[PDB]
């Protein structure tokens, strides 16, 4: 019955959502010409530096077709995306397919964080459960190890060095060079000896990138990297947390193939699970947290703006802490998620996946799904600075809502459209009668810090704009460098500034640049700095600014009644402002 | 005053325009200089986005008029950069700084020279604004006109 | 009909040769492990543009014909030109012809043709591009970019080049990702969190003219507009429209092979409903090619060389002749300038015509037929312009290749096509208009840039090769928000300061020791020909010669008249027959 | 003397004494100028080792770069084959083209066990390479703390 939807995918590491949004989701959305049975576009580009594009198609297109039609499309546009975008891969998969099943990964040691974990299921689970049979994508929670360069602005400043002169460094010393052969051909004749020539081959170890040299003082010394950094394997992402019941967790999102049993291939994963199981390091083990009454059911977490993962983490774990206590006869596990939600993603969002005891073991109706998340929202409506809301998904994706979008169609630009979203959203108050929760399914604009760089002062001090442009991002977002060898197999190296040293405004001056003659200067020189809102989520339909708006019918009011009255109520808005009817609606 | 829920609802309330649920807080003593994790107050909000009467509330309930933000900018600041006028005038009629400097030497007179606001340089200059103040980076008013190519702002300064 | 793939590549100031070498040959030679590709065909033009026909077996898919060609060119992306590339190469599965002409003009008189031309580029054409079936769409306009038109005077007082424009507005005309604060992984007890924005791209004409170039010892500052006007314009300015002789823009559409032509005609009329409610004041749609008929068209050919001008008066006088002589029976006509019926040039152009309703036309002689004789007839006693007037649905002599089998190389190639052109007409009663379908060479400006001299005085030469093209071409540096809208920036000569030879010689390049040499100093030029448009079939160098039998003669003896006129060619020359002689 | 290098190589004992016993050359050598001892002492297989040394192998025989099946050793950790080699004669100072010694190899690779040994024998604690660096240097550029004490 749902119509094939495939979505795009591409990360930009540091990135703002306008900055995503113009540089990649803008010219991605651009090249979508040519594709065949296209009903609408639709895209979000979020402050955590995601886009997602996803493009529904008409009922009874070929999902395949579409898939190839549209990734086609996608990489003709690859070279006009920006190269860190391209390095972190653009994916282009059908979507509106759940996971079959969803494997998670723990250590009941407490010995693992959830890298450690996420890195041996990763090395060693991922690839073998993707080769069982009936098993499409799967998607690990998580990353491998990437090699952490964590910088050191105070000691960078002592030696007069910068985030590009580590980037140099490690791009010169963690390098696999081609070089040739002895008696290679063509030869002289009568040659006896051929042999390859090796050179510099990938660094492996903390070890060895700590003993990168930067510079050699003119009395001697040498500069280490690990003179000016810590060092460490570590996610290539810290954006999600996950826990199990309280402790770290991984795990694997499994999708059933096309044309395969989905029962058979359960038995197959576990299967294949349990031949892992001899091999696992002590402490590891799996647990299943999502069986998909329905037996399972969500947890929603949403905090303030600017709200810290910190903080986020703290509701979690009351969250996981109630259903563990006040639900202890009914509830079997809790995973989870800080980092992400329905409404998007970024620190102040998280979900909680519960599920429940057998349902043969839960007699009564207060120990059914619809009652126990009842107790549970009526509970967590105490939680102060916090929206913590219980639901079962499928009991509440069923049938009286709608699906509108919001269209900029004359430039006007996300100010004046919020404007017009407000407008509408205070008339569709007026009339209870007919609308209920009326609510934007985005994000509302946030505080940002707005670094403005003086190009006459970095002209006169000798100040190199992609100098201070590279030492802000690398230390601030993060920079992918290069490739290293973690235990033959091939990862990441990413370079940023150890925590303490990116975390407040005032660490804007502790980080210097050095200019031409060699003198080293600090930001506060040659920049100024201002907070102003801007977007942690920008939405786009149909290739054209937008902001999606849900809504319910009034008890006593048809679904069409209520969209008809919203056409009216949008009928009267700015000029260049327009609408549309998208998803349940279309 | 009850313990300090009441403040961060005002914060949103002024920050959404919603001059009902201001009059309401307030009525039940809401703190009017309660401040965001940014240091904005409600007179912060509703400078920035423009809400004249949300402005005029706070300011008879005793609203700090200077209040500066952790990088040292009031709603002058705000009002003048993003061109409301008839704030710019309120701000100043109860008292607000016309040389308030931020942390890096920024004046309401160059926030509102920058974006080309002439109406409001001018009432800037009526309550006293220094001509000659230059910023961090040794730039006036004049300057900034300048650099934009701005002369009929060039020739008010 | 088979299915065609045409693959579609631009190379911005690039001649036919510079494009055949560094883009076609490379294409061409990755076309390999492909299915039921019947045959192959390629022009490079001097606009700087390549088109590759890939003509596949009858019966053959075109979904995945396309996808295989898709696949080869992606493998191949890495091999061509950076400047290639970022222009974005397109592939598409569609008939050759228009399905229709939606053209957009404004009653008020209040929006130019460019400015027309914008507005449809960047409002109507992409979600015209998205609806199903229509496999091509080809913009009767451009839409704008921000256009730095550079002044070698003003850059030469500063000691700056071209290079140092481009090289500051990728440096503050740039979007920087700048991380958070509070960003993870996190200290403990971090309580705010929030991006950090640094620049962002720039946004109008006043920022560009702000851009720092460079501060002088004493203190002043050069900013961009002291080297440059600095103004939204069309990122090439080669193709013009009108409607009954008033401004306008349109897109051309095409329909992608296979689909439903009725079908997919009223989804772009749904799709243009929904954006008329939106349009500025004045600005309206006409329909003005809708496919007796009721519709024709006329195509014009100057010879290479010609002028934009020159081409807009023999389109004025076939635009007059229909609003003029056939008043009674022509609803409207769309022309443009710089689109030609094969192929992009400044000596091109062509007409739609759309008639009155059937019923207001009676008679015989005011059917579509008559009509287009009677101006194939009228434009015929045009001076040096092929002007005929022609039919064409939505989805005949013979079709002749020459091709260079053995090096022979273009002008040994052009030499033995005069020799069987002429022995060809040296048979009138069997073969009638045998006539090359391709251009003449023309005279091109050929500069040599003295190596030793260059070196002598220390003056890189990429600086300028780069000062060269960047101000006779025109280079895309990168992008900037128009309205919200991503669009391209380009730096060029102002028009007046790269009209004639004289002029290469007021441009600067600036030496390693600071000292502004000019360009006389280190080059010299001469005149000499060259082809504005070289052609390739199954990957070898080609010209493609029409021709029909001559009356009263079957078309299979013409082509063997052909054949045995192309066996006395010269050693190395061969041929093939294509398209409808296949 | 082809069959012993491969023999020498792959280790297999039995094939390596039918080789002396038929008269092979115990100093044979491969285009890159590896004696068997150079094989056996690289992929560590102690018995050829002492096989070859007893039917008069040169315990200093130099490959085309210099480096002698005492560097194999030392460099990849086989503490056994040595030691077998030290009493047997091998220069314990003995520098390659590039003026790299055993003592060199075995502190890189923090083989501490090899590196008292070689001491033991009268290993130059001060020998420089052709880049002046010393067994101590070596260490501390490494950070292996241990070793770094175990050359005072
Ligand atoms: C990562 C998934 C997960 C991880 C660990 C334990 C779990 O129980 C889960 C899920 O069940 C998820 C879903 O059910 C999704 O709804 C889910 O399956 C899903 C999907 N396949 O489209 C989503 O779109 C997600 N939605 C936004 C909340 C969500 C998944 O993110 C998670
Ligand atoms: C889907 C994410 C997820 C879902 C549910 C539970 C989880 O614990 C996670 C993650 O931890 C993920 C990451 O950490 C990513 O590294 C992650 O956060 C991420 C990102 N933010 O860009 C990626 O690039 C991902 N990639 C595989 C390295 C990866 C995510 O795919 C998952």
């Given at each position: 019955?749902?119509?094939?939807a495939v979505?795009?995918?591409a990360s ?14 803008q ?33 009874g ?36 397919s759940?996971?079959?099943?969803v ?17 041996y299921?990763?090395?060693?689970m991922?690839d ?16 491998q ?7 050191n ?28 052969q ?52 570590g996610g ?40 892992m ?12 947290p ?13 905090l303030?703006a600017?709200?810290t ?9 009351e969250?996981?802490h109630?259903?563990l206590t ?19 993603r ?5 979900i909680?996946?519960?599920?429940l005891k ?16 009842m107790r ?10 916090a ?13 009286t ?27 569709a ?50 920079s ?22 990116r ?12 200019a ?6 600090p ?22 600014p ?22 009216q109520?949008?009928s ?15 | ?37 940014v ?5 912060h ?6 809400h ?12 700090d ?5 952790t ?8 009002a003048?950069h ?12 109860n ?7 931020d ?16 109406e ?20 006036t ?17």
């Amino acid at each position: 019955s749902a119509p094939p939807a495939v979505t795009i995918s591409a990360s930009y590491p540091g990135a703002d959502a306008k900055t995503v949004q113009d540089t990649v989701t803008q010219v991605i959305e651009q090249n979508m010409n040519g594709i065949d049975n296209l009903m609408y576009m639709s895209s979000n580009s979020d402050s955590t530096g995601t886009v997602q594009i996803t493009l529904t198609f008409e009922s009874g297109t070929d999902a395949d077709i579409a898939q190839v039609q549209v990734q086609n499309k996608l990489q003709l546009a690859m070279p006009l995306l920006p190269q860190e975008v391209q390095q972190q891969g653009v994916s282009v998969e059908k979507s509106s397919s759940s996971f079959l099943m969803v494997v998670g990964v723990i250590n009941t040691d407490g010995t693992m964080t959830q890298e450690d974990i996420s890195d041996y299921v990763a090395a060693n689970m991922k690839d073998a459960i993707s080769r069982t049979s009936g098993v499409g994508d799967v998607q690990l929670f998580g990353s491998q190890y990437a090699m952490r360069i964590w910088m050191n602005p105070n000691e960078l400043n002592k030696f007069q060095l910068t985030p590009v002169d580590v980037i140099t460094a490690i791009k010169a010393q963690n390098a696999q060079v081609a070089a040739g052969q002895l008696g290679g051909t063509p030869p002289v004749k009568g040659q006896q000896l051929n042999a390859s020539i090796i050179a510099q081959t990938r660094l492996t170890s903390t070890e060895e990138f700590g003993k990168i040299l930067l510079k050699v003082n003119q009395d001697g010394s040498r500069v280490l990297l690990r003179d000016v950094a810590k060092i460490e394997l570590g996610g290539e992402n810290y954006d999600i947390i996950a826990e199990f019941n309280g402790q770290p967790a991984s795990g694997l999102g499994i999708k059933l193939a096309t044309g395969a049993n989905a029962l058979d291939t359960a038995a197959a994963i576990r299967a294949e699970l349990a031949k892992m199981e001899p091999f696992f390091p002590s402490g590891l083990k799996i647990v299943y947290p999502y069986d998909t009454d329905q037996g399972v059911f969500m947890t929603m977490v949403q905090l303030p703006a600017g709200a810290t993962q910190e903080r986020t983490q703290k509701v979690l774990n009351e969250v996981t802490h109630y259903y563990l206590t006040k639900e202890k006869n009914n509830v079997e596990s809790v995973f989870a998620v800080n980092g992400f939600g329905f409404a998007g993603r970024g620190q102040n969002t998280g979900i909680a996946f519960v599920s429940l005891k057998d349902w043969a073991d839960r007699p009564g109706e207060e120990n059914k799904v619809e009652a126990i998340t009842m107790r549970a929202t009526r509970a967590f409506s105490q939680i102060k600075d916090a929206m913590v809301f219980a639901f079962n998904l499928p009991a509440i994706v069923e049938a009286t809502g709608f699906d509108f979008e919001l269209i900029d169609q004359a430039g006007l630009g996300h100010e004046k459209l919020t404007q017009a979203r407000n407008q509408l959203l205070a008339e569709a108050a007026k009339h209870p009668d007919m609308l209920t929760s009326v609510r934007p399914n985005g994000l509302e604009d946030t505080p940002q810090f707005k670094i403005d760089i003086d190009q006459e002062k970095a002209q006169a001090l000798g100040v190199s704009i992609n100098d201070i442009n590279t030492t802000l991002g690398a230390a601030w977002g993060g920079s992918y460098v290069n490739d290293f060898i973690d235990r033959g197999r091939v990862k990441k190296v990413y370079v940023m500034s150890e925590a303490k040293y990116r975390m407040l405004p005032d660490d804007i001056g502790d980080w210097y640049v050095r200019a031409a003659d060699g003198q080293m200067v600090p930001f506060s020189a040659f920049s100024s700095s201002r907070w102003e809102y801007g977007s942690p989520r920008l939405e786009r339909y149909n290739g054209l600014p937008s902001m999606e708006i849900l809504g319910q019918a009034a008890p006593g009011k048809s679904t069409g009644e209520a969209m008809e009255l919203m056409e009216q109520l949008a009928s009267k808005l700015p000029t260049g402002v327009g609408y549309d009817w998208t998803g349940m609606s279309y | 005053h009850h313990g300090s829920d009441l403040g961060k609802k005002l914060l949103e309330a002024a920050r959404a325009g919603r001059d009902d649920e201001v009059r309401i807080l307030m009525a039940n003593g809401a703190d009017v200089n309660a401040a965001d994790v940014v240091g904005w107050t409600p007179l912060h909000l509703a400078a920035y986005w423009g809400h004249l009467e949300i402005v005029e509330v706070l300011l008879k309930n005793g609203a700090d008029v200077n209040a500066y933000d952790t990088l040292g900018s009031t709603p002058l600041h705000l009002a003048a950069h993003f061109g409301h006028l008839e704030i710019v005038e309120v701000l100043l009629k109860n008292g607000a700084d016309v040389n308030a400097k931020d942390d890096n030497g920024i004046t309401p007179l160059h926030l509102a020279a920058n974006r080309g606001h002439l109406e409001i340089v001018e009432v800037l200059l009526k309550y006293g604004a220094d001509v000659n103040a230059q910023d961090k980076f040794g730039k006036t008013a004049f300057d900034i006109s300048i650099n934009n190519g701005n002369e009929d702002l060039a020739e008010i300064l």
